[PDB]
Amino acid sequence: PQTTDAPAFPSNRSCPYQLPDGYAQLRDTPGPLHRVTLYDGRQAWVVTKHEAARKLLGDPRLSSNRTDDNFPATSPAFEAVRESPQAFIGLDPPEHGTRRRMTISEFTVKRIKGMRPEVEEVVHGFLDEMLAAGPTADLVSQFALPVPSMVICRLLGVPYADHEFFQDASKRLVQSTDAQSALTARNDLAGYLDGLITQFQTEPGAGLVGALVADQLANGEIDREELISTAMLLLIAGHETTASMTSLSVITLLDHPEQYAALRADRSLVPGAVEELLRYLAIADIAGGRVATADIEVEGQLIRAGEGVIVVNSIANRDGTVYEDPDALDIHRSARHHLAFGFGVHQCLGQNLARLELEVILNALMDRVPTLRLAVPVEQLVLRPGTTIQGVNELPVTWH
Ligand code: HEM
């Protein structure tokens, strides 16, 4: 018999908005932790319950150091991160805070509020274009990706004129199935950002990269390679997460037409619906990895120093002790306290930007394209694997 008490992890989704069978199994198994086997045969722990996930994400004994040999890499592609200097996502205190603080001023509530006109312009512009062209369209390449791309590039000071290059590099990295393809995509982006830094040293300019070059880099308070990695992190996260939330939300909303109609009739529901979609779709388990630097006892189970732990926020978000009937999409529920953005010192820096983008995107689609519908059946879509950010390669749509 082939039964194991340490199942292969991660698993791939067969439905965009449902837990893989293996994950539903882990969700139902008692206790905060479960053993899994990673692609390389190493055993790690997964965290599968909501409160335990918050506790462990808050535990400084669980390090985010991706350069540690014992870090729970889930594919050969993940060997691209550990090669070059880490952005603050891969740092622990105190280095984490000193670096994160260099970027936080771009993401304040006041700044995000001030960005609304820009986001609305960008959303409606790419919609103007896609709609004028007429159906059939790929919602991913014509809308879901370029919108957040343009927005984050403005925030960063990355010239949108180079979009074909850096969007392809982003796409290659996210779709990477091996180490060499990931390393090449990373190096391509790194060289591009390196040249941008030199350009800023000659001629100062707007955007976070411009500011970091003029200030911290000029004071030697950040390494050039660290600045590259930081800009890269913000660029890729800025592009890829919102793109996936857009595509998957459209698919999910169209599969729940009663809720989608309700959303259209009462736009005050949009912010709450965005939270529920974030909870339900939980696109970023790829960002729950940790390595124990000391023994941690968790409700009778022992995590040993040197063991990998992955906090699986999609499974945690389906904890029925927190969300009644957790596998039901309910745009009227309180999806508050969800872990789609993590918890603690590494909680998503871009979360409020993401929330603004998704609110504007959903309102715009309901306003401008009320007849939007998929042009192929949901079953024909190709979902990305559990080793990357959740999403679809392409999303064929049509409308009146
Ligand atoms: C759209 C939905 C998004 C989801 C579901 C999401 C998810 C996550 C998660 C789970 C983490 C925690 C990683 C960890 O604990 O190791 C994270 C961190 C982070 N995210 Fe987001 N993200 C989204 C959008 C964005 C956007 C639009 C940006 C803009 C740049 C962004 C930038 C970041 C950064 C810089 C971090 C690292 C924070 C730190 O380590 O201190 N994310 N995100």
Swiss-Prot record:
Q: What does this protein's UniProt record list under function?
A: Involved in the metabolism of vitamin D3 (calciol) and of a number of sulfonylurea herbicides. Catalyzes the two-step hydroxylation (25- and 1-alpha-hydroxylation) of vitamin D3 (VD3) to yield its active form 1-alpha,25-dihydroxyvitamin D3 (calcitriol). The second reaction is the hydroxylation of the C1-alpha-position of calcidiol to produce calcitriol. It can also hydroxylate vitamin D2.
Pfam families cross-referenced by the UniProt entry: p450
Swiss-Prot/TrEMBL catalytic activity? calciol + 2 reduced [2Fe-2S]-[ferredoxin] + O2 + 2 H(+) = calcidiol + 2 oxidized [2Fe-2S]-[ferredoxin] + H2O; calcidiol + 2 reduced [2Fe-2S]-[ferredoxin] + O2 + 2 H(+) = calcitriol + 2 oxidized [2Fe-2S]-[ferredoxin] + H2O
Q: Which of the seven top EC classes does this enzyme belong to?
A: oxidoreductase
Sites where the protein binds heme: H96, R100, R290, H346, C348
Region (Disordered): which ranges?
1-17
**Keywords assigned:** Cytoplasm, Heme, Iron, Metal-binding, Monooxygenase, Oxidoreductase
> What biological processes does GO assign it?
vitamin D3 metabolic process
Is the Cytoplasm keyword given for this protein? yes
This one is known as Vitamin D3 dihydroxylase
Example GO CC term: the record gives:
cytoplasm
The record gives the effect of mutating V174A as:
Decrease of the hydroxylase activity for both 25-hydroxyvitamin D3 and 1-alpha-hydroxyvitamin D3
Give the EC number(s) under which this enzyme is classified.
1.14.15.22
UniProt lists the gene as cyp105A1
Inducing stimuli: By herbicides.
Where it mainly occurs, coarsely classed, is cytoplasm
Please give the Gene Ontology molecular function terms for this protein.
Answer: heme binding; iron ion binding; oxidoreductase activity, acting on paired donors, with incorporation or reduction of molecular oxygen, NAD(P)H as one donor, and incorporation of one atom of oxygen
